[PDB]
Amino acid sequence: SLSAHEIRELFLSFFEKKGHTRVKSAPLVPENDPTLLFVNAGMVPFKNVFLGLEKRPYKRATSCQKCLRVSGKHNDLEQVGYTSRHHTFFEMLGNFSFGDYFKKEAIEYAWEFVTEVLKLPKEKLYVSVYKDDEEAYRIWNEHIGIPSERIWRLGEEDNFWQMGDVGPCGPSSEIYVDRGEEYEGDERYLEIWNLVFMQYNRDENGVLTPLPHPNIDTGMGLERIASVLQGKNSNFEIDIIFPLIQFGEEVSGKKYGEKFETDVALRVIADHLRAITFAISDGVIPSNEGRGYVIRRILRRAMRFGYKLGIENPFLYKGVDLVVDIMKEPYPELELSREFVKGIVKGEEKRFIKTLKAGMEYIQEVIQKALEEGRKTLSGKEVFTAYDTYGFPVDLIDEIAREKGLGIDLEGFQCELEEQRERARKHPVYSHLKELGKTSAFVGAAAL
Hints:
BirA Bifunctional Protein, domain 2, 2 domains, nine-stranded mixed beta sheet, ligase, beta sheet and flanking helices, class II aminoacyl-tRNA synthetase, helix-loop-helix motif
């Protein structure tokens, strides 16, 4: 059935034989990019190289990058747990060309790997291309031989990528696996590989001109492709993740697959265990600002769901061990940080656990008092209290209230955030007034 570990190795060795230099995964924390909290895609560490800026001894590269989609324009944290495809931490397999090969080769390599290495049947495969990328269509249709019926021509929103507002961009092509009649939409036609063709440069006026040296960037989610080969209908059921779900069941005494709310809780724990382990192992220390606050929120969210399941004591620190045992083969450095990470996690849990419980009683109390008195949201005052008195992240407060159909008064919270400010000034993170509410979603109350 092929394990996630075997697929990771097959992918890297495959491109090595195609002249690609295997490149170690860059750390989750960017060495010199204060604006990006965490690496979210395989290409991030090669950005300056794609821009011709940095130089490299090789023109072809391949790697399995550790990624986190928990910030900025690539934030999936809210959805984690509610679907079977969303993750905070995940591995992206990718092959890159820096002014070397382009579309033809990129498509031939991907097709070869999928049909000849992974052994997925060609008739169950589909591909998408940009409606105006006649070049990509022809390669797929004539060179590879995909019947026109299995080739979709889509728009800018589906098949056109951009590094940003200005700069490199171009059409893209995705490969889909048809999982069968028992599924629907994107769950039936599961995207397994995205190929980006960096072909143009968009100037400050929006005008596109072809790059003198076009580039290639690809990304295949490891967890996702593993679920296909292993015959699972969820990323959480694959070999390298299911043990974390089972961990949750054990510590809670609850079973996976009986109730939706339960599964959500177990999935959150499993997913967040992976994120905290790798993030702390790469140097992130839980705090009330920046990278540290993201991990703190993730940690707190996992504690909240475990508590929701009835777990009364610290338990995440035991999950860290399981993550290290599962991931030590591809990431051996995790063993040298095992105890250090386990210590940080345990410390964090023992520090906030009582407050988490007290805070949950407070929030539920105002929630029930709200729907009782016919209110439809929590006031800014009640939000501030949960945020400032109990240390509850704003996103966590909202998630809890949402479970009861209530929302949080965002403008009432802002005014209250200003009052405390004016109060603190009369009666390192800098924030503009009117922006306090926004900032409060990414910093702890003490930071502001």
